[PDB]
């Protein structure tokens, strides 16, 4: 996240950190995700597409730091990894970029609620906030496009939803953005999501609930003028989600 503030998991208790193991001894961070129900986490298919080996991923809940432990964190293995049939990537956009990870702990249980672990609400079918709404994004992604390391402390920032008409303007993304995507940016192009933030949540208040409105998907550069961040529009995948959850 470019800009934003450093935060703790108590402020985003539904945030999930997904890592990959290389038996060489190291575990590296892959993407963020969000807990939907006790046993299911939602993220982005493009985070797994290249190495769809579920046995090499570890999911942690209740984590405020990237490589150090947080008291109260929970570790799970991925029991099922459901990627979107029809996921497609082009020169920028990822289409149908949503994935579901079913989690199980070594004791065979799903997540349990605590002051650092909570589910986030899903929207109702095709129901979104109106453009202008300020939503927040969280993650361990880069703080500057030139960085080659990720922060150790979780960050968050507030961004506003913009209309498709504005995002599909030729000097923004044109038709690369579809109705199954949402664009969000800072009025002054000062904060944004960036590499390392993929799969995490775009949370907005909808009908009184803090709802998972989008999943961090792609963007040209980070915090660039006229280059909003693009998110998978969760309201449009509710049947898919239900088909599996």
């Amino acid at each position: 996240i470019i800009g934003g503030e450093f935060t703790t998991i108590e402020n985003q208790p539904w945030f999930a950190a997904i890592y990959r193991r290389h038996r060489g001894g190291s575990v590296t961070y892959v993407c963020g995700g969000s807990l939907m129900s006790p046993c299911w986490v939602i993220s982005a298919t493009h985070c797994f597409i290249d190495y769809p080996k579920k046995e090499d991923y570890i999911v942690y809940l209740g984590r405020s730091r990237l490589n150090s432990n947080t008291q109260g964190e929970m570790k799970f293995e991925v029991e099922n990894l459901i990627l979107h049939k029809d996921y497609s990537a082009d020169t920028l956009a990822h289409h149908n970029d949503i994935a579901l990870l079913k989690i199980r702990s070594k004791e065979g249980r799903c997540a349990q609620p605590s002051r650092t672990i909570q589910t986030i609400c899903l929207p109702s079918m095709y129901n979104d906030p109106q453009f202008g709404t300020s939503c927040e994004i969280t993650g361990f992604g880069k703080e500057a496009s030139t960085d080659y390391l990720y922060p150790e402390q979780l960050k968050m920032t507030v961004v506003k939803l913009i209309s498709h008409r504005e995002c599909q303007q030729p000097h923004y993304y044109g038709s690369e953005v579809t109705t199954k995507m949402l664009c969000a940016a800072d009025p002054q192009w000062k904060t944004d999501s960036c590499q390392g933030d993929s799969g995490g949540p775009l949370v907005c208040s909808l009908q009184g609930r803090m709802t998972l409105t989008g999943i961090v998907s792609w963007g040209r550069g980070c915090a660039l003028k006229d280059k909003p961040g693009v998110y998978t529009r969760v309201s449009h995948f509710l049947p898919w989600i239900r088909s599996h959850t």
Binding site: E10, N11, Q12, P38, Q118, T119, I120, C121, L122, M210
Partner: peptide, 13 residues
């Protein structure tokens, strides 16, 4: 009653 019932989506506090 079982733990799962104690999740309230979207509730931080």
């Amino acid at each position: 009653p079982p733990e799962e019932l104690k999740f309230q989506c979207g509730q931080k506090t």
